[PDB]
Amino acid sequence: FHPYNTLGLATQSAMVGLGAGVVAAAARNSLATGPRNILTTFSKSGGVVTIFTGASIAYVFTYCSAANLRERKDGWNHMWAGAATGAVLGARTKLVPAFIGWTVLCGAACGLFGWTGARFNADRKASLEQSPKGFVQEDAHQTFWEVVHRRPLSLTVEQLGEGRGINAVPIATATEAPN
Amino acid sequence: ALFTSLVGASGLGFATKFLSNKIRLKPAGYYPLGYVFSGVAWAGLGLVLHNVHQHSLEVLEKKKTAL
Amino acid sequence: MFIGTIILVLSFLGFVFNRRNIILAFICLETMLLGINLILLRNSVLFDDISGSLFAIVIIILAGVESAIGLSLLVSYYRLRGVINSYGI
Amino acid sequence: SSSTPLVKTSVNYSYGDYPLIDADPHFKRVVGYMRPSDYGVIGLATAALPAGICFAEWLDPVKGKFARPSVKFLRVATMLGFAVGFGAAYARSSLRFFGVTENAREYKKDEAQMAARKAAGLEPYGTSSLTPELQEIAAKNSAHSIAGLFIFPWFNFVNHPYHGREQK
Amino acid sequence: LPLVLISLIVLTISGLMIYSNDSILINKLLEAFGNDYNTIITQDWFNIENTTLLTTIGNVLLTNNAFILLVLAIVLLLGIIGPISITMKHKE
Amino acid sequence: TFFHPKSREDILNEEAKIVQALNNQRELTIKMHELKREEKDYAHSYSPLFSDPVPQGGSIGKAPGSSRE
Amino acid sequence: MLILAIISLITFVSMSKLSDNRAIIRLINIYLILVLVLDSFLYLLFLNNQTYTVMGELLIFNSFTFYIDMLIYFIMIVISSLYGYNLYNNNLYKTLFEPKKELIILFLINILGALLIVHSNDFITLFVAIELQSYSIYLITAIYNSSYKASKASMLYFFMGGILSILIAYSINTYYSVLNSYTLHSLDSLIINTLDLNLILIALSLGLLFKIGIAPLHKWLISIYENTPILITIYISLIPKISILSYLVLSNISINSLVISILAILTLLVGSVGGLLQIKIKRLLAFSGLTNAGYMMLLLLLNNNEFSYLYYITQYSISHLAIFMIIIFSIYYINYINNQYNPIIYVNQLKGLIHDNAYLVLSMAIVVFSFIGIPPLLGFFGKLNILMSILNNGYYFISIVLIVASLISALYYLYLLNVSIQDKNNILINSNETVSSVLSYILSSLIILITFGFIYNSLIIDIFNVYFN
């Protein structure tokens, strides 16, 4: 893998969240009911700026940190980032069990989002349609979407491990009397 | 088979007539000629689908023959 | 390109941030169509192409019919209510 | 006046399993090559629509009691039914021209008609009042227009040479 | 004013960026403002007729695009039939 | 003596015919998925009669020197 | 046939009284039936997916569009039957459901615009047809001008559709500015990967999609569907959706868009959650249509989506018509007429319908469990084919969102059934008035289709494999 620059990405994160919070505050000011002016965009906004900035900083910082600590790029980093973002969103409600639930559940949700590829889109060169499918032809290495009538036994033993029934030689041939 | 398809489509037509009579809060034998009319209508639809399907299969077989 | 984008954007903002009238909404729609037609005709001239002018004259016709229908709908609303107020469409 | 094409066309294209006659047949040909089955379809629709509204009045009547619909509605019904039937007949004959349905009779008739036209030194598919460019535009407007019979009617009246056949 | 200004900037800049095919985003605005160099108008002698813009509009609208004219006819029919349905009250 | 079950051979043969029909439907589904999403002709996809994609434009001031291959 | 119908009905309605409009609707309903019977053999033109370009290159005709047109004729037949045949021959039902003089003409013109949208190959035709649809459907929302709510909805719908049409025109003219063309056939592999073109194309897609309620722009159309008459809602909630989504499915415009994915997820979540606290029937059904529109948005990202879209739109049309017809039939047993225009508004007015009409509740149950996607019904096979396509094309998070939305929507779908199978005091014991024969048969036929159409899935696939592949 290639390391992430935490502080730079998180500074970009904070500026983006700040701009988004300003836009949401302006939208709230214009959509609202009561008497309002150019003063109220930050007085009467329900912590929108702090929501956006905190979520952005927390998510990007935690993601890049976990990617640099774990030394990997996978969906567990999105699980941690969701845990942190949920902790921020749940510290607003000044209650412990709601904070814990927010953390755990948005961690699980963003971790699912990362497990599935960290994308609302598709890869479109890893999809089943664009990838080699069906039965594999002549002793070739079975790819992900390919099908096989009969698999290699060394592969089974490595993927699964010896023990609990699964052995490098069948039992009957391995116990056959040398006659 | 054709006869099976026509019988089943006529059964669907009888079901429509029955459910119509019941939505109307009438007895199930209110006007028994409607069963005959529904039968022949739905059987005509089924015959149409049967013929379309048969022509489709004939096309995909003519392709093999010409291949 | 510039005049049309400017008229379009300002008409859209004067439609969105209108707390005054319904007539301003009608006007902003018509001026939006105007801006599109002007961009369209400038490109028609630069490419030396007729499809743009055809689309433009079609927009003229369609916008006329739009105005007629919209101001019939307003008249029905006024048939029932008798006053078209600052708010409530 | 020259009756020679400006753009290239397909030669003997296959719209179905049967051979091609004309890819954009004239109204005259589509009506003259009709079969008695087509006229039967016309009469069938012409009779079915008014009978249809009387059947509807029998099933669920407008007022409480059954009353045969006015002759007003029966007249308009007959007219609309004849129109629907002419549409279906024109479509059947045009699909026979395209090679989508069985067209052996129409094939031999077209062969004989074109041979007689060549014998009389006449242009195949006729001579037009329009320039070649307008013949092209007309063909491109009318070609395969029967596919949109559900929406709009459009028919060939222009005598263009862009029927999808060999040059002679 | 905040949303008005934000939307003014965003919408104008996007409307000027949308017309160019360049990949980098900032350059897409910079090409829109690249109105510096004049167009040369040379003269040809191939157009023999007196065809103007209205003549060509008619030609294409009545030959190449006859369908949209005969659909605009139904649009104008709506323009007549709708307002009567909405404004008039039919007695019986 | 009341037990009159279908023999093993006929059972195996009937099951084999069923599996052969199922594999035939499989191969048909694969063939149809492959015949779709396969590039078709301009005549089959757009225009069977006017099969020339090349545009011939206006005609009122046609300049010699405007066509190009 | 439609233009013949329009030009005939304009004259025949001008020269006829208001006492004749119901019979006029009956006549044109039989006309559409005869057309769909006699002229439907044209499917043979599209054998092996032969495609035709008509009116220069302004229209496109293939199996997809022929099917959508047959479907729109079927829908118009049902909607015209609801106006041409009285449910009950009482003074109440001659006060609630009366056709206005121009309504049938506007319906046929809107159908014309719908079909010229799906058949469009050039953007000038698309724009003319979009406007012919939208003007006519403004006037359809407004024709019941004695309703305050309907006039208000007319004007809101005018302005919002106008703005979204401005967006469509901007997209079209920008496409022209870039490529000097109005035709999407002008695009290929090379032009897509050589020009960055996604802003224009997604602007077009969203201008078309927000006209059918795609979030976050759903509240206005849901208010319009609430505030309109029931027999107008049944039309204006279905036919525009079919038209625009069919155009966007035939035109492969958003094959792997991130914005469309995001907005489709948002449509699913909103259409599932927002319908949970709705106490009114039409808003509930509007949010149902919203989430189904999301399911159909998902297959704008596929490039091979004909079977799934056609199955789902057909089954959704049948279910939509059936549920609105059941709500129309339930008015005889509700104990409180709310309006002259929306006689039934709230779901709790359906309380105890099983004790007055049990088989109507059987129909409701079938339709509700098809909406939920319960096998062996038709919505299950719809959802299955959609899932098949989106998982074959690599949308794995959207699939889980789809399952969660399918589950959350079941609650407000089951609200109806639950209150319908509850007990009620003051049940019905006798009634000498009988509901119509024709409308009863139509509803029963739709229910039987939902219930027993899975028998023919093999045959439908075998026909599709010849006419669409």
Ligand SMILES: CCCCCCCCCCCCCCCCCC(=O)OC[C@H](COP(=O)(O)OCCN)OC(=O)CCCCCCCCCCCCCCCCC
């Ligand atoms: C200024 C400097 C700029 C610097 C450059 C960088 C800036 C980045 C800016 C990013 C965009 C920020 C936009 C913020 C959203 C708009 C503001 C908003 O409030 O949206 C909601 C809006 C009003 O809501 P409100 O009136 O406040 O009342 C709420 C009570 N429920 O009401 C609305 O309906 C409008 C909704 C708009 C939504 C847009 C589409 C969002 C897509 C949703 C994503 C969902 C995907 C997640 C899927 C997970 C599935 C489990």
Ligand SMILES: CCCCCCCCCCCCCCCCCC(=O)OC[C@H](COP(=O)(O)OCCN)OC(=O)CCCCCCCCCCCCCCCCC
């Ligand atoms: C209709 C009412 C009348 C008013 C009209 C107003 C003018 C119209 C403006 C344009 C048209 C509206 C477009 C609607 C928004 C949705 C556009 C869209 O979704 O297209 C995005 C598309 C990429 O998305 P996609 O194709 O789905 O994903 C694959 C990615 N490779 O394509 C793209 O990649 C987009 C390219 C990115 C650049 C966007 C430009 C924004 C620049 C703003 C900078 C402002 C400066 C900083 C902040 C200032 C605030 C103080």
Ligand SMILES: CCCCCCCCCCCC(=O)OC[C@H](COP(=O)(O)OCC[N+](C)(C)C)OC(=O)CCCCCCCCCCC
């Ligand atoms: C067509 C009127 C639609 C109105 C609604 C009624 C549904 C009719 C379904 C027939 C479709 C067909 O048979 O066709 C199959 C089509 C393409 O075939 P096609 O080109 O259209 O040829 C058909 C030629 N016809 C018109 C002469 C018949 O494939 C599809 O994806 C259809 C998906 C629809 C699934 C819904 C199944 C409903 C159960 C049917 C119980 C009888």
Ligand SMILES: CCCCCCCCCCCCO[C@H]1O[C@H](CO)[C@@H](O[C@H]2O[C@@H](CO)[C@H](O)[C@H](O)[C@@H]2O)[C@H](O)[C@H]1O
């Ligand atoms: C509400 C209950 C939720 C519980 C249900 C959980 C089901 C979620 C689906 C889990 C399976 C997803 O499958 C996952 O597998 C492979 C690894 O095997 C991931 O692995 C792939 O990730 C993507 C993202 O970098 C790249 O293509 C990468 O090269 C790798 O191939 C995929 O990103 C994902 O598709």
Ligand SMILES: CCCCCCCCCCCCO[C@H]1O[C@H](CO)[C@@H](O[C@H]2O[C@@H](CO)[C@H](O)[C@H](O)[C@@H]2O)[C@H](O)[C@H]1O
């Ligand atoms: C709840 C159960 C249902 C969940 C819904 C989703 C079901 C589908 C599961 C997701 C499939 C993910 O599959 C995706 O990742 C695998 C790796 O694991 C990749 O498979 C590829 O991995 C690469 C390594 O990166 C290797 O070279 C391997 O030989 C293969 O080519 C493919 O890019 C793709 O097939």
